[PDB]
Write a protein that binds this ligand. Structure first.
Ligand SMILES: CN(C)c1ccccc1CNc1ccc(C(N)=O)cn1
Ligand SMILES: CN(C)c1ccccc1CNc1ccc(C(N)=O)cn1
Lengths: 238, 238
């Protein structure tokens, strides 16, 4: 339907089984809502030892991905994608991912995700082959595969059929009714649908204010949200 | 040595093969620098259908993780860890991970990572069993397993033997010397070690200023960094 195709360039394509074989994303793949197709630069080498790294000009302790096998793998993925695939490189230098960015990326029917290893890739391939650079957060990983899988999982939630507002989630409770002396809030047992809705929203506002108050500055709260937030801050200050 | 033990509670422990079987983290596991041990709540069920989810009090469309199998799995992991393991729950409601937070977390010799599925876990288990909540970024995933693997990979880079300053990385170049008409900066072929160091630092300052200027506000630049940043901004404005 609104299915999504994701090409992946990675030296460790088997890592992607973590999303393609399990849970909600594994079901999306099995039901053809999400297709994930991997190309490995190692298969595009020609020397006897299948070399995929190379030395940086200028010296330094690290290696980079070797240009030729990576470029050839990218070209093959682009040819398989046909027209209109956006090519994304995952790196700490990229645009910081957030939920608005996920929903932007989810608009593409095709994406190609390039997973860097070693110290990364040659800057000229970014210029010539990459459309957008994205980061999953301000921290350093050993390769771009976990960022690519994170991005796939986040976008997959927007594909119609895969599943069944700016604020943090409210607390949730399940059985039993008392757990190490802690009881479930009585409103949640009241059956009063509207009191339950307002309690949950007031809790989300309170938790957002206490934990991540900067997230509130970016929202235009509704009148109801403004009132419940005021109530929660009054209670907090009592 | 400074090895690290990470207990994981997950309904999909096989996802963790993505970090334990491949690349730098797979080597860390093989060489006993990193141990990752998984417990699955499904193995702590007692009904015929091995039920691991439960309905939220108050209604709503989602399910939560069932308390009893999850609590029992957590208790088993804590007993295996012995004393001093910090128990972390991965969620969007948690403290936002960044590199300073990774280095804080890397100080622990033992961690237990609880991976939520469905709409998450009962709030009272957070109160009774979880030490810290952490988020990998402001976006929603289908479970906490990719956040846990991201955290493991980021912390593993701090374990002595696993591998071979606030700014984004400089561009890097490898063979060939000309690539679709784009040449390598001559300084990197100069062999002048000190000119190369300064060029790389000036590029990191320039890229940080242009892409993520808020990161600069949190740094106390050195005199040399202040001078190279000034030079880069002068060049940019020429
Ligand atoms: C080895 N490095 C630093 C590297 C350098 C450049 C590109 C890819 C990599 C692979 N590592 C990544 C990738 C993404 C993220 C992120 N925060 O999105 C963190 N680490
Ligand atoms: C299903 N949800 C929303 C959920 C709710 C609460 C806990 C765990 C989960 C599992 N999903 C996660 C986990 C972490 C992150 C993150 N940004 O660190 C994103 N999603």
């Amino acid at each position: 339907g609104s299915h999504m195709w994701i090409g992946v360039i990675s030296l460790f394509p088997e890592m992607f089984k973590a999303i393609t074989e399990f849970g909600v994303t594994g079901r999306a793949v099995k039901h053809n809502l999400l297709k994930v197709e991997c190309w490995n630069p190692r298969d595009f080498t020609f020397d006897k030892h299948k070399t995929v790294d190379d030395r940086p000009y200028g010296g330094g302790p690290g290696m980079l991905m070797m240009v030729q096998p990576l470029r050839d793998a990218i070209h093959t993925a682009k040819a398989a994608a046909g027209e209109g695939a956006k090519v994304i490189y995952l790196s700490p230098q990229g645009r910081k991912l957030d939920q608005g960015g996920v929903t932007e990326l989810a608009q593409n029917q095709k994406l190609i995700l390039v997973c860097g290893r070693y110290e990364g890739i040659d800057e000229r391939l970014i210029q010539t082959e990459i459309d957008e650079e994205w980061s999953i957060g301000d921290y350093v990983l050993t390769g771009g595969e976990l960022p690519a899988m994170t991005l796939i999982d986040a976008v997959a939630r927007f594909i119609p059929g895969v599943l069944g507002d700016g604020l943090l989630d409210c607390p949730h409770y399940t059985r039993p009714e008392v757990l190490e002396g802690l009881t479930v809030p009585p409103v949640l047992m009241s059956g009063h649908h509207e009191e339950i809705r307002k309690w949950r929203l007031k809790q989300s506002l309170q938790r957002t204010w206490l934990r991540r108050p900067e997230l509130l500055e970016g929202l235009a709260l509704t009148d109801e949200q403004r009132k419940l937030l005021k109530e929660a801050q009054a209670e907090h200050n009592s």
